[PDB]
């Protein structure tokens, strides 16, 4: 529910900084990563995270509570760097983090090693999360989360039904794209757009009956931006609770979306600032008071086609000594 508000807050930042571009991220991945960071934080630094993530009202128990669906965490620790036993224990308990010892000074080697792990846990869909330019003698720790999903639509589109259609961008320009089609039994509702003053919500289940894709679409005459301010956690819940299974004529593009986001900017927008400064309190992760969070990275991939969807997101955290 937390994740709910989190997702919407983070999305709003990305709208703000993402002038008219595609957006894609995984709030789940970001929460798991920040969960791991939080285990390291203390005092002021921990309190700020907890608040920003909405945990004031632990959260580790909820975080633990986690077709193909895979979630993996790993820790890369500088050789001979002494990490708090307690940190390590919790990290295993709550995140089942793989723990690896590396020499960050061997910067090409370590980048390759971390990138291989990413590939191994995203079906190769996310590449170059890190680079050798990320690592040196000052690097102490990297923590990574990956989320990976692959599912067939419960009711697949037949490739024979896919035809070229004009897609009208919100800047009124047009592109011709492959447009999948089926008449299927999906969950559908109509909501007032606040203004034919309605928008459509369509929920399409995947095989396995656990996961779905929800699509939200304004009337043709109206830009998506008109609907965006409406998007709040309470509304998301309402959408889920208001759609009715029925026959629907569905025209949906075959598409891929990718995004690398400035995760530091996003977290800062949530109010998370202390971890990023020299005098951060990460005394939870070790007795080494010189440590702070240098880089926060998030990259995602989504493919949508006739058979279903395949998606991955990875969040990475790189900690250094001043």
């Amino acid at each position: 529910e937390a994740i709910a508000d989190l997702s919407v807050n983070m999305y709003n930042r990305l709208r703000a900084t993402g002038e008219d571009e595609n957006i894609l991220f995984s709030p789940l991945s970001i929460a798991l990563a920040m969960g791991m960071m939080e285990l390291g934080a203390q005092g002021s630094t921990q309190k700020e995270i907890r608040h920003s993530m909405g945990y004031d009202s632990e959260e580790f128990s909820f975080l633990k509570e986690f077709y193909v669906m895979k979630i993996a965490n790993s820790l890369f620790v500088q050789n001979g760097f002494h990490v708090n036993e307690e940190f390590l224990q919790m990290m295993k308990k709550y995140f089942n983090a793989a723990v690896n010892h590396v020499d960050f000074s061997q910067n090409v080697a370590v980048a390759n090693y971390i990138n291989k792990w990413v590939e191994n846990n995203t079906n190769n869909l996310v590449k170059d999360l890190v680079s050798p330019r990320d690592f040196d003698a000052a690097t102490y720790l990297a923590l990574i989360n990956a989320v990976y999903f692959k599912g067939n639509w419960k009711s697949q589109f037949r490739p024979e039904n896919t035809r070229t259609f004009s897609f009208t961008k919100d800047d009124e320009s047009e592109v011709q794209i492959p447009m999948m089609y089926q008449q299927g039994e999906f969950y559908y509702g109509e909501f007032s757009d606040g203004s034919g003053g309605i928008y459509q919500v369509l929920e399409i289940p995947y095989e396995g009956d656990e996961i779905s894709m929800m699509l939200v679409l304004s009337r043709q005459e109206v830009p998506l931006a008109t609907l965006e301010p409406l998007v709040k956690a309470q509304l998301v819940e309402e959408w889920a609770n208001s759609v009715k299974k029925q026959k629907v004529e569905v025209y949906l593009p075959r598409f891929t979306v990718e995004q690398e986001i400035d995760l530091k900017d996003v977290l800062k927008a949530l109010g998370i600032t202390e971890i990023f400064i020299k005098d951060a309190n990460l005394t939870g992760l070790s007795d080494n008071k010189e440590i702070f969070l240098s880089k926060a990275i998030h990259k995602s991939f989504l493919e949508v086609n006739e058979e279903g969807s395949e998606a991955a997101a990875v969040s990475g955290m790189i900690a250094i000594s001043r």
Binding site: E1, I3, A4, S7, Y11, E21, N22, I23, L24, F25, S26, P27, L28, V147, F149, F165, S166, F167, T168, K169, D170, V175, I177, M179, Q183, Y188, Q200, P205, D209, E210, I211, S212, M213, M214, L215, V216, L217, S218, L224, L227, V231, V236, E237, A240, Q246, V248, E249, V250, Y251, L252, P253, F255, T256, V257, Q259, S300, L302, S309, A311, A313
Partner: protein, 35 residues
């Protein structure tokens, strides 16, 4: 009966969610769908 038509031929918002728990896995928008 006239079935609704959802014709995704302009920008849209999307979410991939756990139906049971409500957890949001992925979220975003497509402003530019072309290759």
């Amino acid at each position: 009966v006239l079935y609704p038509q959802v014709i995704v031929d302009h920008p849209f918002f999307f979410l991939i969610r756990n139906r049971r728990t409500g957890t949001i896995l992925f979220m975003g928008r497509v402003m530019h769908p072309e290759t």
